[PDB]
Amino acid sequence: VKLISSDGHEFIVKREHALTSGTIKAMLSGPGQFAENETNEVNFREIPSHVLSKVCMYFTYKVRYTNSSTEIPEFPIAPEIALELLMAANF
């Protein structure tokens, strides 16, 4: 999984975590057609690398958290930047 942000920043995600992420209902079914090519090179528009990084980290965390890391508490609600991501709405 190769993510591409508006800043031209590429993010390579390990398939090990990607598989688990795919199990969760993501915005992959949002657009009209999400062909195999789109699943390889995912280009996002109006989405900065900075905010995308937090999303990727949260996904990575969630993958482990809902797997073998459910012993710890939920993500620390310290940085109030999650609502900023919710501003996208279609995510």
């Binding site: 109030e80 930047i81 609502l83």
Partner: protein, 32 residues
């Protein structure tokens, strides 16, 4: 969709929403 629900399960922020400021990359704090 996904993040729409995951965001609430990440941080419960009851702050104001306003169009993102082009100066940086974050939503402004006002109302609309």
């Amino acid at each position: 969709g996904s993040l729409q629900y995951l965001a609430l399960a990440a941080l419960i922020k009851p702050k104001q929403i306003k169009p993102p400021l082009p100066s940086v990359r974050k939503l402004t704090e006002d109302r609309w």
